[PDB]
Design a protein around this ligand. Structure first.
Ligand SMILES: [Zn+2]
Ligand SMILES: [Zn+2]
Lengths: 241, 237
C-alpha cells in the first residue's frame, strides 16, 4: 500500500515491531540476556501511540522502567538511570530502548497519523513538531509546569538551520530528534557507568519509531544497537543490520 | 504485609477493587472503552506498571504524563497533547499518585524486587529527595533536572518529614500532596484544551507496591470529574 511504500522510500531499512523484537532478543540471547535476568528500560514519547513498542518488548523482558517524556528524550536523566540500575536482577543486565517517533498517514504523509476515535489526528510527534516550529521561526528571523517542552526546544535549536532547509521537514524532524536524543543518552550512560557493576552490562537499541494507522504494523528504524560493559566501554556493536 | 498496609491505610483497595470501582462509577457518566483516553502520572519505577496495565485492560493504551516519583512532568504541553488525542466527543481519565514499597516484613519504603537479594528504596526518587531536603532543613541542564524538581517540590515538607515517627510511611503522603497541587495547576491552566461536553475524570492517591506474589494496593485521595470549563461536576469522595 501507499503507507508501506512511503515508509520504505524514506527508510529502506525499517523493521516491523515484530521483526525488531525477534532480531534484538535473538542477538541478545547469545550474550546471556534472558527474561529473568534482564531489566527493560524505555525512553519513548509520552504519546499513547508509542505504547505498542513497549508492550512488544515487555512480552519478552517483562515490566519496564520508563526514562522518557516529551518527544522521547530520556528526561529521567542521571537519577532515573541510577534508580533503574539499582533494580537490575543480580548478575544481570539492562536493555534500553529509545527513540524519536513520527506518524505516517494512509496517504503516506509524514508527521501525522489517524488516531482512534478522531476524524483529525493532529501532529505526530506533537511535541517535536511544536518545538520545530518555535526554533525554525526564531531562526528564520535571521518551573516544572512546562519545563520539559522547554528542554525539547533547547535540544532542537542546533538543528534549526537543518530543519528550515529540509525538503520534507516531517521526515527530517525525527532524524534530528533522534540525533539530539542519542547524544543525551550517551552522556547519561557515560555519567552513570558507576551504577553498573562487574559483569553487568547495558544493551542499547536506539532509532526512529514509525507510527502507522492502527490496522497496520508499526515500524522502527534502528540507528544504534550495541552493548556496553560496566566500565562504560563498548563491547559489541551490531550495526549495521 | 497486609496488616501493615491496613494499619497505616485502612481504606486501601486492591488494584482489582480500584479498577472495578472506578470503571463502574464512570460507566454511569458515559465513560466507556471507545470514547475514553487513559492518561497516567506514575513513577518511572518498573513496579508501578501493574496499575497502568490493570486500567489499560479497561480503557486501552495510555498517555504517560509522569516521571520521577510520579510527578506530572509532561506538564502543560503534555496535557495539551493528550487532550488533542481524546476521541471526538469523549473524555480523559487521569490516574496519578505517589507510591511506596512495603516488604514481606511489613517495613515501609522498600519492597523485594525480581532477581535481587536486596530491593533498595521504593520510592527511590522520593527517598533520595527526602534525604536531601531534610538534611538541609536540619542544618536549620536536562541531565538531572527532573530529580532537581522533585527536591524542589518536596522542600516545603522538610519539617513534616524530619518530625515523622516513620518517615517512610509519611513520605508518600507528602509526595501525593505535592503532586495533587501540580496536577490541579496543570488542569486549571490547560482547561482550554478540553472542549464541549468533554470531561476530565481524575483519580489520585498513593500506590502501594507489595511483593510480587501479593496484590498491590491503592489509597484513593481524589476521585472526581471536571467539565470543559474546569469546574468540578462530580466528587465521589
Ligand atoms: Zn511524540
Ligand atoms: Zn518511585
Amino acid at each position: 500500500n501507499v503507507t508501506l511504500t512511503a515508509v520504505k522510500k524514506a527508510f529502506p531499512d525499517a523493521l516491523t515491531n515484530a521483526e525488531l523484537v525477534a532480531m534484538v532478543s535473538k542477538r541478545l540471547s547469545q550474550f546471556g540476556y534472558h527474561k529473568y535476568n534482564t531489566l527493560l528500560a524505555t525512553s519513548l514519547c509520552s504519546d499513547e501511540v508509542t505504547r505498542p513498542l513497549e508492550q512488544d518488548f515487555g512480552e519478552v523482558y517483562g515490566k519496564h522502567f520508563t526514562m522518557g517524556g516529551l518527544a522521547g528524550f530520556p528526561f529521567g536523566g542521571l537519577t532515573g538511570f541510577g534508580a533503574m540500575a539499582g533494580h537490575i536482577p543480580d548478575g544481570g543486565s539492562c536493555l534500553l530502548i529509545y527513540g524519536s517517533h513520527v506518524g505516517v498517514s494512509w496517504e503516506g504523509k509524514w508527521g501525522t497519523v489517524a488516531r482512534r476515535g478522531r476524524e483529525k489526528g493532529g501532529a505526530c510527534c506533537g511535541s517535536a513538531v511544536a518545538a520545530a516550529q518555535a526554533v525554525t521561526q526564531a531562526y528564520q528571523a535571521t518551573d516544572p509546569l512546562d519545563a520539559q517542552q522547554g528542554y525539547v526546544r533547547d535540544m532542537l535549536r542546533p538543528y534549526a538551520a537543518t530543519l528550515s532547509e529540509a525538503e520534507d521537514v516531517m521526515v527530517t524532524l525525527p532524524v534530528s530528534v533522534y540525533d539530539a536524543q542519542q547524544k543525551l543518552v550517551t552522556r547519561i550512560l557515560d555519567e552513570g557507568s558507576n551504577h553498573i557493576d562487574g559483569d553487568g552490562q547495558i544493551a542499547v537499541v536506539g532509532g526512529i519509531q514509525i507510527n502507522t494507522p492502527k490496522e497496520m504494523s508499526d515500524f522502527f528504524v534502528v540507528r544504534r544497537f550495541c552493548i556496553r560493559d560496566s566500565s562504560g566501554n563498548m563491547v559489541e556493536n551490531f550495526m549495521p543490520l
